[PDB]
Design a protein around this ligand. Sequence first.
Ligand SMILES: CCc1cccc2c(C(=O)N3CCc4ocnc4C3)[nH]nc12
Ligand SMILES: [Ca+2]
Ligand SMILES: [Ca+2]
Ligand SMILES: [Ca+2]
Ligand SMILES: [Zn+2]
Ligand SMILES: [Zn+2]
Length: 231
Amino acid sequence: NLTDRQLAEEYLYRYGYTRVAEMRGESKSLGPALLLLQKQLSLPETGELDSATLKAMRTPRCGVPDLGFQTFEGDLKWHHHNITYWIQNYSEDLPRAVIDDAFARAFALWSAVTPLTFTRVYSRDADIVIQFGVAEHGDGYPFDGKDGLLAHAFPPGPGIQGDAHFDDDELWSLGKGQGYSLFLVAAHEFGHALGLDHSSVPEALMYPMYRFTEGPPLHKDDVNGIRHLYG
Ligand SMILES: CCc1cccc2c(C(=O)N3CCc4ocnc4C3)[nH]nc12
Ligand SMILES: [Ca+2]
Ligand SMILES: [Ca+2]
Ligand SMILES: [Ca+2]
Ligand SMILES: [Zn+2]
Ligand SMILES: [Zn+2]
């Protein structure tokens, strides 16, 4: 129950737009930050809090910032071919075998277009630790309750780097009837865990907003992104 104006100020802060406007001497009023967001999300570039921009801001999305103060270790790509993953805990929203299969299908999408392989393990030292969490869940990037941000993930590297977390204040499903597709959100978050950033192409898997589809989720932009990372 923020005003539209308050939601806009919070969205622009959280995803990195306000900080870039400050570095350009232009954080006194909303217009410059709105133009940065419109370019980054491929909306019409009006510099106004218009209907398209407010609808974009109310849309469920990824919790990773779009522009950006979090320093990580190393060059943010994996340096071995066999990437391991551990499912640390489970949402009660789905059967464990359906959760396991949703993540395995999300890895299979990336496996075909990268020289990496993805193997399930049962170990704390897996490259990609998968966790379900609510609000403050042990990393100082707290979730926000139902809707808004759905999940986040860290770029390749040691410890927390490469891990994927899902907001369990969300209802997880396969995206049909009620709830968010765990398969589609996992495929997006696993992109980050391989070293990809957000796309500006609205049809691309790596676009930040949640879009349900029954079609093949990869687009040219995603496949080309991976190609420009891993020889
Ligand atoms: C939400 C976790 C988080 C907080 C701040 C920055 C984050 C990033 C991030 O910096 N990037 C997204 C992944 C990436 O690959 C190459 N560069 C990047 C940049 N990923 N997860 C992040
Ligand atoms: Ca890790
Ligand atoms: Ca949420
Ligand atoms: Ca839940
Ligand atoms: Zn994302
Ligand atoms: Zn987290």
